Write a protein that binds this ligand. Structure first.
Ligand SMILES: Nc1ncnc2c1ncn2[C@@H]1O[C@H](COP(=O)(O)OP(=O)(O)OP(O)(O)=S)[C@@H](O)[C@H]1O
Ligand SMILES: Nc1ncnc2c1ncn2[C@@H]1O[C@H](COP(=O)(O)OP(=O)(O)OP(O)(O)=S)[C@@H](O)[C@H]1O
Ligand SMILES: Nc1ncnc2c1ncn2[C@@H]1O[C@H](COP(=O)(O)OP(=O)(O)O)[C@@H](O)[C@H]1O
Ligand SMILES: [Mg+2]
Ligand SMILES: [Mg+2]
Lengths: 330, 278, 346, 328
């Protein structure tokens, strides 16, 4: 029918999980009419677009929504001229009248909402333009800015907008939602799974849902009618097996440059992701009791530097080889 | 198998014009057209059989009788002597317009040169001048003809509308109402609407909510019924209405618009698929 | 046609080098309706595009391989004319936004939002896939449009983007896709594929060892190994011996010569000659990232260097690769890497 | 309908007596009004410190009723290129005043967003039509203003709001909304505000929304931290103690447990630990350099995103390593 992420997107504010602070504030705003300008920020896949769509629906209903909502995202031009003309014109617009059905069934507060999703992709000029548009029309229009990186939002807009931080969805936060989705889609999982899914998917319920869907598709294609094991989950999540990681650690322990170079060549031929293996190396080294404090300090800084360099779209082979060579000389 | 027909413009200008009307419509829709040369009728089909980056979904299924042709000798190994044939529409347009220009004598078409060809022959008098044309065609098989089937339309929501004829008091008025949507450059998706009667063409834009209506009395061939379609389909509809006296406009709520045109018989149906869901 | 294209597996059952990945692809293609967005990542030349096309054939049937190419025009902020080639077959679309530079955002917006909103009803509605080759080359601005385009319009379009080393792919895009890892074939499987190719091609082979040599010299690159096979087939009158030389691309030979020169003579004039060689390499549109990678891994293969020199070389290579990622002119960082290497070797 | 507005643009001052914090600026502008002479003003300071409020209240006080036809206000939302400055501003400050008399006001909100060409054109308008028009330039960043434009303006600096101003405004809002506030909640709000009143009003609105019955229940520091999603000071002290004293494994475990207890972010912990360490008396001086450099690098990397576990362990390792010089 549909991918489980878009199939199980929350429809009302009750379905949004583990973000209680923002959701209670918004639910209380439902019965009031003084909704502020909101700045939704948090890690990817934490429930921000879901929250804003659920609130907008609960506010206006399917009918008034089309006339009282303007959504701008990164897929459309949002330059200084667009911010100065289209957003200002929509804010200037008078509030369209509700119908009888809208007035009785939905709350229909006396204002319109401008949702600026992916606001971290806007230049500082456009945000400076938005400052006074947000301010001088605060009684007729409300602004919602959604982003992952707050630092990309200029200080004036961050001051005007009320800040709603969305927590990362760990195992404890999203285990109930994952169980709900698994049970309703008839997913047979071994105990321990649905927690490994959320541990691999660090602060990301979209990734966890897609992982569950892929595991379900595999277990259904097998036709064997057995549960999903954690090993399968780690296999199709891109996690390096513990034996390969152990070989990496043992070749690092014997600090011979040529052996490490050859092993890294074969491993990068195996197609793994450098970020994932760097993360696994972090877990192995920092949690190991066989190393002293000095080694752990140096390894923590080395892993931080490697992660920062990998985040810049560099060469995975060179970065991984340099990291492992540095570890071998620690 | 053998294919040959006799078409004279002078004996029946009306059905010959209907034939030329069809050739142009199938050319305008897209290239090529299936000529289902049945032994007892001709059906000219222009179907996408879909779209990937264009939007072509419009399907025109024109039925013309055999009596239109003076001679319609058609034989083959298929059921009821069915020959199905695809040819580029530009060449057929050129052939038909050349014959029309010469007439302004009979036109003889025989199947003569997998990839076959047709042969169009006719004489011009100013003196004896012969005009011979050869359009490259393809011998389509029965199996490929089987998959070409006209779209079946439901009748649970298909409200019919009997549009006023092109000739008469309302003929120019309704033509103007139909073509009034063409005078804007930001109109790509028109939104038909019918309330149980009125025919409202609704344009949705941020500038101003345009709501063209039709105040004239309108009948039904026999509740809202709204269908959003593209503008090229409406251009084809206007061109169909221009050359058709009896026209039926059928609407499927949030589904498709069926433009039924008849010539009391040679019938033309244009199937138009919704572009956006209301 | 080349032997890479002549013997391309046209079906999901015709892929015979990874098996487990084929099983996963069949599991995905069993029920195409709930197909998610896919991200195929693995070493270059392993066969990711072949796997995508095989999955598309499994879903939409034969006919996905009837590619029609058309040129569609764009307009930028400065109103210049850009022409992107869109290899379009029925049931799917191919786009290489990297054909334009930083101006790929307008493509990812116009061309993709056009098809995302445009439905595929013909009463029955299908979803048309879109293939994005080289997803790494997007400039963090095309990806920002991409994420909402595919999140909101999932009902009508499906995205299958191929890439290698998906680190330059942003977290919102990676979180929105199913991550499919495509490992490179082992030398045995490459040798088996080459054996099938030579058998179907009537090339006289002296011994099977000369196929393992091709497989090892290609470094797990099916296309590169097949191109080597055809090269020595047509340069030895279709009869290959153990005396037949392993042939490598010209730029690889140039980089190895540069490595030899850098190790041998280390002076400012040598630096200038190395700069001339690097400019010649860049004149052949060889990306600077792979130039630096090949230079580093050729300098680490020299046996006259001790462990300290090799560790310094790899450290400088990592530093200057990060610099090259954030830079604008490649020659600064290439020259800096070569100068640091020449200063550390002595 | 002032009950249908966010708390920030519901308690915007209407008179100069309602602008707290900037005692000197308000006193001087009141004296300028009383004496009848107003120079070309320039208001500069951090966001949310009372610049637009002050200028609008001052203009309302000068022109109580003629405000519509006596003040021309422009901001970043309006195009202010060379043509706008040449035509609109000049024609406004070139015509005689409405009603009996006076001087026209031209307020330029967010003038640091203006190009250098527009400011260069504006300088001669300022110097030429000053007899009957006065300018007010509002700016957060003074480096975007041409030195000539700064030269021909009287500079007034808006300091970040002190404790007393925020406390008085909080008391006013609590009286207006029939809300209660614990003294510890008051301190927490003061510290999170960082000299901004918009932040205070937004947080207070969210705190009223959080409460089940905002007519009976108070607001404690617990509600403050729960709604704003910030680490409690006790949590920051515990994390720093675990990092400094305990070994690596238990320090990492304590960091993760504290983070997962309330879903805290690592950047908030970093800022809290930096604020705590700034009071620390370091004895090696290289302990500070290492701390500042490493933590700035970690904060920048966090701002660009990435692996949270790696960054947290990097924070722990950076702190333990730097404090190695302290004992040296
Ligand atoms: N708290 C939540 N409760 C329920 N579903 C959630 C929650 N957070 C995320 N999801 C699911 O995650 C998927 C996408 O989440 P979204 O909120 O739409 O995306 P997002 O949070 O904006 O991440 P971005 O846009 O990349 S920053 C949907 O399938 C949601 O159901
Ligand atoms: N001195 C003050 N006294 C009372 N409320 C204040 C004061 N300063 C700011 N505020 C509040 O802050 C809100 C917005 O601050 P403004 O002064 O209008 O913005 P601003 O000072 O111009 O900052 P920028 O540069 O425009 S982001 C007002 O509506 C008041 O509620
Ligand atoms: N299982 C296989 N059997 C035979 N040939 C294959 C197989 N997989 C890949 N190839 C060959 O590899 C060549 C290049 O692979 P390609 O799909 O271009 O890799 P990439 O997707 O990384 O560019 C193709 O020409 C194809 O013929
Ligand atoms: Mg989103
Ligand atoms: Mg202001």
């Amino acid at each position: 029918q549909q991918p489980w992420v878009e199939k199980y997107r929350p429809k009302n504010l009750d379905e949004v999980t583990a973000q209680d602070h923002a959701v209670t504030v918004l639910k209380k705003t439902l019965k009031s009419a003084n909704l502020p300008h909101m700045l939704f920020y948090g890690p990817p896949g934490t429930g921000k677009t879901s929250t804003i769509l659920a609130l907008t629906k609960e506010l206006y209903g399917p009918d008034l929504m089309k006339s009282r909502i303007l959504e701008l995202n990164a897929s459309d031009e949002r330059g200084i001229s667009i911010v100065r003309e289209k957003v200002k014109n929509f804010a200037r617009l008078t509030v369209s009248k509700p119908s009888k059905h809208d007035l009785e069934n939905y709350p229909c507060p006396p204002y319109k909402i401008i949702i600026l999703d992916e606001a971290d992709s806007m230049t500082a000029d456009a945000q400076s333009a938005l400052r006074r548009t947000m301010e001088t029309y605060s009684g007729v229009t409300r602004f919602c800015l959604i982003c992952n990186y707050v630092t990309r939002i200029i200080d004036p807009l961050a001051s005007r907008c009320s800040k709603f931080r969305f927590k990362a969805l760990d195992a404890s936060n999203a285990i109930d939602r994952l169980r709900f989705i698994s049970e309703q889609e008839n997913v047979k999982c071994d105990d321990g799974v649905l927690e490994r899914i959320l541990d691999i998917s660090a602060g990301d319920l979209r990734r966890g849902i897609t992982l569950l869907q892929s595991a379900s598709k595999g277990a259904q294609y097998l036709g064997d009618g057995k549960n999903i094991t954690s090993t399968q989950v780690e296999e199709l999540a891109g996690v390096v097996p513990h034996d390969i990681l152990i070989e990496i650690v043992e070749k690092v322990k014997s600090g011979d440059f040529d052996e490490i170079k050859k092993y890294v060549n074969t491993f990068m031929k195996s197609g793994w992701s450098a970020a994932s293996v760097v993360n696994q190396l972090h877990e192995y080294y920092i949690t190991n009791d066989n190393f002293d404090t000095n080694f752990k300090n140096q390894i923590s800084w080395l892993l931080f530097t490697t992660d920062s360099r990998l985040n810049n779209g560099t060469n995975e082979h060179i970065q991984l080889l340099n990291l492992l060579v540095k570890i071998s000389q620690l | 198998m053998k294919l040959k027909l006799i078409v004279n413009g002078c004996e029946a200008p009306d059905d010959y014009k209907l034939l030329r009307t069809t050739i142009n419509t199938v050319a305008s829709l897209r290239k090529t057209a299936i000529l289902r040369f049945n032994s007892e009728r001709l059906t000219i089909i222009s179907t996408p059989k879909g779209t990937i980056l264009r939007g072509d979904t419009g399907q025109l299924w024109c039925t013309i009788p055999h009596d239109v042709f003076r001679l319609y000798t058609v034989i083959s190994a298929r059921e009821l002597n069915t020959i199905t044939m695809e040819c580029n529409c530009d060449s057929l347009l050129s052939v038909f317009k050349r014959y029309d220009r010469v007439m302004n004598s009979n036109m003889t078409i025989k199947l003569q040169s997998p990839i076959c060809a047709l042969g169009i022959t006719f004489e011009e008098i100013v003196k004896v001048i012969m005009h011979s044309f050869k359009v490259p065609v393809k011998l389509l098989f029965r199996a490929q003809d089987t998959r070409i089937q006209e779209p079946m339309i439901n009748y649970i929501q298909l409200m019919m509308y009997k549009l006023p004829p092109i000739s008469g008091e309302f003929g120019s008025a309704f033509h103007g109402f139909i073509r009034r949507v063409e005078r804007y450059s930001n109109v790509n998706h028109i939104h038909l609407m019918g309330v149980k009667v009125e025919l409202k063409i609704i344009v949705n834009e941020l500038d101003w909510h345009l709501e063209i209506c039709w105040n004239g009395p309108l009948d039904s061939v026999i509740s809202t019924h709204e269908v959003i379609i593209r503008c090229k389909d409406w251009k084809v509809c206007s061109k169909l209405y221009a050359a058709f006296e009896e026209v039926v406009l059928a609407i499927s709520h949030d589904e498709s618009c069926v433009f039924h045109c008849s010539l009391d018989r040679g019938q033309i149906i244009y199937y138009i698929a919704r572009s956006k869901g209301l | 046609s080349l032997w890479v294209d002549k013997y391309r597996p046209k079906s999901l059952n015709a892929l015979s080098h990874n098996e487990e990945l084929t099983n996963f692809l069949k599991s995905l293609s069993d029920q195409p309706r709930d197909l998610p967005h896919l991200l195929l990542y693995g070493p270059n030349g392993t066969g990711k595009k072949t796997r995508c096309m095989a999955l598309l054939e499994s879903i939409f049937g034969p006919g996905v391989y009837r590619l029609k190419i058309d040129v569609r025009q764009f307009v930028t902020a400065s109103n210049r004319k850009l022409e992107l080639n869109v290899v379009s077959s029925p049931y799917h679309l191919e786009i290489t936004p990297s054909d334009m530079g930083n101006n790929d955002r307008i493509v990812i917006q116009e061309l993709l939002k056009e098809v995302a909103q445009m439905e595929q009803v013909d009463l029955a509605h299908r979803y048309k896939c879109v293939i994005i080759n080289e997803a790494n080359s997007l400039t963090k601005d095309a990806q920002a449009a991409l994420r909402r385009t595919m999140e909101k319009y999932s009902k009508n379009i499906r995205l299958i983007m191929v890439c290698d080393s998906m680190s330059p792919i942003i977290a919102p895009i990676k979180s929105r896709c199913l991550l499919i890892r495509c490992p490179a074939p082992s030398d045995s499987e490459i040798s088996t594929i080459l054996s099938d190719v030579v058998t179907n091609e009537r090339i006289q082979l002296e011994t099977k060892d000369i196929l393992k040599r091709i497989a090892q010299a290609s470094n797990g690159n099916l296309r590169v190994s097949l191109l080597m096979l055809e090269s020595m087939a047509l340069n030895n009158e279709l009869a290959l011996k153990s005396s037949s030389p392993i042939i490598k691309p010209d730029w690889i030979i140039v980089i190895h010569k540069l490595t030899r020169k850098i190790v041998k003579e280390r002076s400012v004039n040598s630096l200038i000659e190395c700069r001339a060689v690097l400019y010649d390499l860049l004149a052949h549109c060889i990306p600077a990232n792979i130039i630096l990678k090949e230079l580093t891994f050729s300098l680490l293969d020299v046996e006259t260097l001790n462990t300290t020199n090799k560790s310094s070389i790899i450290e400088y290579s990592s530093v200057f690769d990060e610099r090259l990622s954030l830079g604008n002119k490649a020659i600064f960082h290439l020259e800096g890497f070569i100068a640091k290497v020449m200063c550390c070797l002595d | 309908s002032k009950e249908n507005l966010p708390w920030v643009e519901k308690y915007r001052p209407e008179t100069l007596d309602e602008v707290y914090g900037q005692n000197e600026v308000i006193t001087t502008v009141r004296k300028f009004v009383d004496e009848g002479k107003l120079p070309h003003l320039l208001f500069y300071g951090p966001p949310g410190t009372g610049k637009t409020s002050t200028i609008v209240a001052l203009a309302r006080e000068i022109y109580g009723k003629n405000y519509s036809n006596m003040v021309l206000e422009l901001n970043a939302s309006d195009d202010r290129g060379i043509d706008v400055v040449r035509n609109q501003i000049k024609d406004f400050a070139s015509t005689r005043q409405i009603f009996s008399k006076g001087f026209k006001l031209i307020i330029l909100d967010e003038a640091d967003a203006m190009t250098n060409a527009a400011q260069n054109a504006l300088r001669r308008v300022i110097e030429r039509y000053t007899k009957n028009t006065r300018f007010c330039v509002l700016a957060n960043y003074a480096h975007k203003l041409t030195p000539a434009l700064l030269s021909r303006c009287t500079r007034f600096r808006f300091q970040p709001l002190p404790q007393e101003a925020i406390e008085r405004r909080i008391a006013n809002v609590l009286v207006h909304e029939k809300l209660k506030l614990s003294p510890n909640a008051e301190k927490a709000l003061i510290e999170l505000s960082n000299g901004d009143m918009r932040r205070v009003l937004n947080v207070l609105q969210s705190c009223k929304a959080t409460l089940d019955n905002p007519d009976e229940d108070e607001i404690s520091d617990d509600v403050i931290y729960e709604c704003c999603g910030a680490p409690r000071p006790s949590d920051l002290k515990a994390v720093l103690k675990s990092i400094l004293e305990d070994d690596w494994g238990t320090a990492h475990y304590t960091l993760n447990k504290v983070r997962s207890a309330k879903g805290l972010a690592l950047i908030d912990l970093i800022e809290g630990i930096v604020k705590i360490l700034e009071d620390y008396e370091l004895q090696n001086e290289e302990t500070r350099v290492h701390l500042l450099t490493k933590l700035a690098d970690i904060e920048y990397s966090i701002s660009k995103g990435g692996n949270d576990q790696i960054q947290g362990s990097a924070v722990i390792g950076a702190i333990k390593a730097s404090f190695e010089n302290e004992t040296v």
